[model samples]
Target: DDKDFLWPAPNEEQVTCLKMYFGHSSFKPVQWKVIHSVLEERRDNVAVMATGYGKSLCFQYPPVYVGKIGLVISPLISLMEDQVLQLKMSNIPACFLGSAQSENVLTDIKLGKYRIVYVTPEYCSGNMGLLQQLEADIGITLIAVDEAHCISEWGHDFRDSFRKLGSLKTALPMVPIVALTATASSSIREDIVRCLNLRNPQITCTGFDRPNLYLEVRRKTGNILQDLQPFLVKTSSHWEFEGPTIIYCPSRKMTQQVTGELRKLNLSCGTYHAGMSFSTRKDIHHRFVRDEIQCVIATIAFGMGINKADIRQVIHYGAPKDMESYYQEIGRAGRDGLQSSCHVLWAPADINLNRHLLTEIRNEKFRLYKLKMMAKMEKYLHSSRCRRQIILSHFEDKQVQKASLGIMGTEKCCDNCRS
Candidate 1:
């Protein structure tokens, strides 16, 4: 069935609900297919689409269409708050458990006050009591695990909390569970399905190639912030730099350090990390989304549910752990499907640090996977081939050969292609 797969034609009511809720006249075929599988067919879904593909819409539609409560298992606190805020602004009945009054939110849920409720995976796993009450009284239709790649050992940002999500299905087997992620390889996809204990899940994967994003890598120098100056400062140079940008750092300390350094160059930026207070991080998140701050220096903790569409450049201060995360980070750029760029400033120490971190894990197979992932990332950093092909082929995208041209034919694709 996977081989001979086809997208479903949305029923008339489905189209009606789509336009009524999201206000789009139409949607992509794949988007409709993902929603239809759960709403009409009543089967579990494993959707592996790239960033900006509107995976949010696909999951949001089913719960609203069926007029039932959908449980969203989000990873981070910031991600959950942002998701719920966006939903509420759209006039959708949504709430998260992070609110001040826990019992009040539970009371609202039983009273049919919310259509969608976002909860952290750790909280959900520990509190089956809440689930049981909802299943018994209210209609719980679907369960969506956002950033579902965290469930896999093969995934770069694997979380132990995500493993317990399978128990939700065991408690409510009749309801559909849709596991979604923007970045997941073929192996990671299989790992998710196996670990989530999904039944005959309809696996949907979109192409990983982002032709609108021009890719490049450069050796990190001691004067890296000065090196990033040209990219941040607009000029008659080959790459323009007026637009919004993001600098991804390896540690929380680096985010603050980079913020301080960028200020020395008079660049206006904001800092976000796990260590920051909730209100401060929320303020920065709002500023970045509204373009108040053009540059956001952040750690990996800043990702998952932030969906700002106009980020023009994503610069890595150093190499990340693996290719899945690298691709995922760069995905923030060119989300508007316009010409955007991402640069990786890498050093050997980044790789070595990753190796040292991996050695802390006790499982032999898990550590081996970490090593294998690190090797692939190293190859990508050191490759002379078109960076597009190198990344596309990593995710098994057949369009690897076709990623040769975009904005300027040579400059349109990647740095090496121009050479």
Candidate 2:
């Protein structure tokens, strides 16, 4: 590795070296402790920090301390590519090695030339023969699992690929592991630890609190589209921005329709859902990063480690499945430290739609449980308590901090707390 971007910290030297190399005023509480635990103590950690609170840095910053190669397990190829590019630009020796890349590309990873290699859990676990080969050749020092919440039924982005993680861990027992996720309720948090089989795993919850961003919701009112049309039309001008904005919908067809409506108003927008072609998905990511597009109408599948820093707003066209999903996705706004808004305009129809979608999933048990969870979310949408309080307490976090916008506090912020 080139010396310019290589961060070397041997023993006690690692902490001091990282402080200077990363130019940190000071490590956030537990930041360096987590790093040291992984590097020195050789412990695996699971972090449930809120989005934009520097969760990505926890894994990205460790390669400097350990010269051995690091592999990040990610679900999406687009997300893997973006993260790799961002790490590389920061002068870290990073590259995403996945099934999408040819077997020829595995040569560098096999030779231990790539310091950071990222792959989907599905690919790595499904190809145990290849993993055995890599283990024999270069050896993996750190295994970082991004979006670790998906392993649990309580998690927002549940994936079948996540279950394969345990097998991979069994195959590489000695490797240090770090699991990062922004959203995980109390139950879901415990599920993540158990699923990964971490070694005395430390669970860190940053809690959901963003003072700069405003959190508000509009009730279904039996006419969601009518209620939302005005906001959409009035705010269309704000859609033209230096960075991409996100509009989350309940359905793929809704995403397409919403994009068309936004474009009809002369706002530059696109759509992204689980159904789009891999090539289109890749292009959408590129266009957003390059500023060729201003907004994207998407479902929950659209976000994960999205590094675009100037998103001014994040609108939800339907009810969120749970507060965890809502809080994490809302945290995506104002990442650039600018004032931003997260608005949810929901309709009763969304509840039915969500339930229908759940019923269609391949797993019968998960669909039944998830259906019940969606019903709980519907009640939350109609509750008469502080939305922030309900969400925070749901995660087993009692400490409440006031946001700058006054939308989150002990009371009078969330619609539920208001009468």
Candidate 3:
């Protein structure tokens, strides 16, 4: 029977609904496959796709196609709000249930007024009364855990709240669940499936090659500000910046320092970190998305669920802790399929700096795991092989040997390749 259960093709009505809601004629890449697995086949799924691959459409469309509500377990408050606003703007009935909701929103949720509802893992795990009402009256068809890699300890953004997501399965035993993440290694994939208790899940990995993105790494010189100046000037055309750009720093202090330095160069920039006030952060996020600001200098806290499509460049002033974080940060560029650049300035001493930061982790095993991750990043920076191949191999992708090149020729694929 397992062999007999083929994925059903999307019906005409489903295709028409896709056009009506999102204005796209067909599903992109592995989206329809994930949709069919959940909506038509009625099986759980774990989808590991790259950023900008349209994972949201996979879960969002299924509820409309199947005539049932969807529950999305998102990780960040800002991400939830962004998705809800975008969905509502498209004339799709969507809402988010969080701590800041007013009584009217709660009343609307209880009345089953929205086709899709987004909630954080902590909120979903604690709200037994809401879960019961949704199961009894509203009838959730599919549960989508976005940023599902957070369920795995090996993942770069692991959170303890994501671990408690097994409660959703306990409360609604029959509902199909879909776990989705932009970045996850093979081991992390297994951990996610195990933590979420996916039942005989259909595992789908749309490979992690962003062809439009040019990947390059450089050794950081002693002068940070001086080294970054040329790349910024080249990308932004002498500070007359054309498209939105992100410069990822190692910490809040570096973010502010970089923002101040960019301003002194007369480059319009904004800073985002955990230390900023919620209103200030919200204002900056809104302005950046609307293209009011040319660049945002921030830590890793700035990018998840951001919908801006024209990010032309992403520069990491210093290397991130692991390949997952590095890849995810770079994937933010060239989302519209235009040529973009991803440059990482790696300082050998940066590895030691990260090791110092890892000591803050209370668990010895977790700290060691982070150390290993940093080692992988160091190897990547120092590798002589194709940059794309090195990244695909880390994800344990099947196509590592016959690696796909972003450009037609291998020689033009990367800076080292060109040389």
Candidate 4:
């Protein structure tokens, strides 16, 4: 009732459209609000949802009832193509506007056959002709910017093309835009809104807490693999938690180094980093997905690509530079809503290395921002309180729950609470 003024309850048509297309009988808390804001109120919006929280449906459900195509500006070709593939399998009209698309995709897009179009920021900035034609002919009912944090310099992954997206509002003055990202602090969030030039956008930032994820942080001692032997041994056992594993290292060499140690342990694993050959990286990515490789040691260059929902373990070989990257990396686990453990093994050496890496950035302001973030990551490493509470507080996630401590539930929420 409180949000009724801004986000009215979904009408019958909206409810039916959801069930008919997406097979959901009811909307999640924020999904309909986003849909209503863009289609009915004609206002800009931003959604900072957690991974696998049905962020796409917020934009996907808008086009049908509104009777106009929606444009989703995604960052990666693989991610966009994946969405397009899912839409096609669901029997929805979707198109991936890229070089890899079919010969007839251009004409099919122009024919207004596709109700949803996925494109990269590069294509949006470069191929204004087709978008302008869509705006005039069939109409672009809405624009959804995925991974919108890339638009802000303060965000973990800043891209020049994403910064160029401010012009999208200028070009399509009438169309409403909805920007979405998985992880961003309050400061970086405001920066994203400012960069996108959103006009009175409705903000839907769901809580950051992934209750199914058991959070734990440990100080590095002895050999890192030896410290992680308890978790590593289960990856080879009959345990249900042995789905898949990902270990994120701060450096490329650490990835191989960790993989080598695991190999010595007689545990087969794959290494993925930017320095590896393209085909090698591709093979690792493919094998890991197909379950041929049970574990992967990688860097941030493999960002946001893994879609395995049952990833049972995600370990940080070194603490990440900031909280956003930390949250995003660990957030990869338990996407299937199963109980999974996320471990962080931080040593004093990680701090010096990350500090040196930050010094490589030429931008004074961003460098300073990352320096401040380093302090936050350090505090998180040394904190004694429930890790969930600490992380929720960092993101300003309100409505913090009281029932999360280990005593209140069967599963321990965090290593600190386990005691």
TM-score of 3: 0.53
Q: Which stretches of model 3 miss by more than 4 angstroms?
A: 1-176, 179-205, 234-238, 351-362, 400-412
Candidate 4 residue 238 Cα shift, in angstroms, is 13
Better of 3 and 4 by TM-score: 3
| TM-score, one value per model | 0.53, 0.49, 0.53, 0.53
State each model's C-alpha RMSD to the native.
17.0, 17.5, 17.0, 16.0
Relative to the true structure, how large is the alpha-carbon lDDT of every model?
A: 0.75, 0.68, 0.75, 0.76
**Model 3 Cα lDDT, one tens digit per residue, 204-315:** 6565566787788888886756877676554344473456889898867878787887787677788888876778888887898888888998888888756677898898
Taking all chains together, the TM-score of candidate 4 against the true structure is 0.53
Give per-candidate clash totals. Answer: 0, 5, 0, 0
Looking at model 1, the pairs that clash are none
Residues 93-125 of candidate 1: C-alpha lDDT, one tens digit per residue: 998875364776878887778989888887888
Question: Order the candidates by lDDT, highest first — what do you get?
Answer: 4, 1, 3, 2
Per-residue error for 355 in candidate 4, Å, reads 4.8
What's the residue-level lDDT of 48 in candidate 2?
Answer: 73
Candidate 4 lDDT for residue 281: 78
lDDT of 2: 0.68
Candidate 4 residue 95 C-alpha distance from true site, Å? 32
Query: What TM value does model 1 have?
Result: 0.53
